[PDB]
Design a protein around this nucleic acid. Sequence first.
DNA 1: ATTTAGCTGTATAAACATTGTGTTATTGGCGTTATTAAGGTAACTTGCTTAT
Length: 48
Amino acid sequence: QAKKEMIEANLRLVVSEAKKYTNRGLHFLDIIQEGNIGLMKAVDKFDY
DNA sequence: ATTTAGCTGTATAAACATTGTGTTATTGGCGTTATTAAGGTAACTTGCTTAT
C-alpha cells in the first residue's frame, strides 16, 4: 500500500520522459508502459 | 573305311572373380574461438503527441 501510494504520484514521470522519444518506431502507449515498469522497480531500491 | 573338317572342349589362358590389403576418409568428439545477453547505473527534467 505504501509503495502504491508513492508510485501513483510519480506516474506522470514516464509520460514526461516519453516525450523525447515519440517517433523511434514505438507508439506513445508502449513507451509509457515501459516507463511505468522502470519506475516501479526503481522506487523499492531507493533509500531515504 | 579314313580322314577330314568340323567342333569348339576345357585347360589354359586370359580375363575375371574373390579374397585381402592397404588408404582415406568421415562421423564423433572435444575443445575452441567468434557472439551474445543481461545486470547495473540514480543532480534534473513527473497528462502526452497527433493529426485535413
